[PDB]
């Protein structure tokens, strides 16, 4: 219905706004673009499902997210990929892991404060009806 299309459009506006606020944070720069195969050749072979904030924006615009739950699965993937690729005790790895957890924590905190629970429930019920 038109009301349901309006609901998903509001969802996309909300998700673009959250994603933009993450992408402009200097801490999260490393998560804003896919990994360069030239600088890091073994990334594509180690990380089977790469994810980054530019790809998240692309997926929003392709209508790939029908709920905030599905969006947070990709935020979680950005973070979990970073922890898996940088597991060592060296400061370079520890810095990226700290930033990855901060990205995840920040996304969840924005959503906890700004996502209306009844709006998410409506999205989920439309999704389940398709
Ligand atoms: C996106 C992501 O997780 C990523 C990009 S580079 C990297 N890790 C390194 O470059 C290692 C050298 N210090 C750690 N991780």
* Residue 18: CATH number of its domain: 1.20.920.10
The coordinates were experimentally obtained by: X-ray
Q: Measured from the CB, is residue 111 less than 6 Å from ligand 1?
A: no
The total number of structural domains in the chain stands at: 1
Closest ligand 1 atom to 81 CA: 3
**Substitution candidate for ligand 1 out of 82, 86, 87 with most atoms within 8 A of CB:** 86
> Measuring CA to CA, which residue among 105, 113, 109, 114 is closest to residue 14?
114
Alpha-carbon span 31 to 15, nearest angstrom: 16
Domain interval for residue 93: 1-130
Burial profile 82-91: b = 16 or more Cβ within 10 angstroms, e = fewer: beebbeeeee
Residue among 19, 92, 120, 25 at smallest CA distance from 60: 19
CA–CA separation, 48 vs 46, rounded Å? Answer: 6
């Amino acid at each position: 219905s038109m009301q349901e299309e309006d609901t998903f459009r509001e969802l996309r506006i909300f998700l673009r706004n959250v994603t933009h606020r993450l992408a402009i944070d200097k801490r999260f720069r490393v998560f804003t673009k896919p990994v360069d195969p030239d600088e890091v050749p073994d990334y594509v072979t180690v990380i089977k499902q790469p994810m980054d904030l530019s790809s998240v924006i692309s997926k929003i615009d392709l209508h790939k997210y029908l709920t905030v739950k599905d969006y947070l699965r990709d935020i979680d993937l950005i973070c979990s990929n970073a922890l898996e690729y940088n597991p060592d005790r060296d400061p370079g790895d520890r810095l990226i892991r700290h930033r990855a957890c901060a990205l995840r924590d920040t996304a969840y905190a924005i959503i906890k404060e700004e996502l209306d629970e009844d709006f998410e429930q409506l999205c989920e019920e439309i999704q389940e009806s398709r």
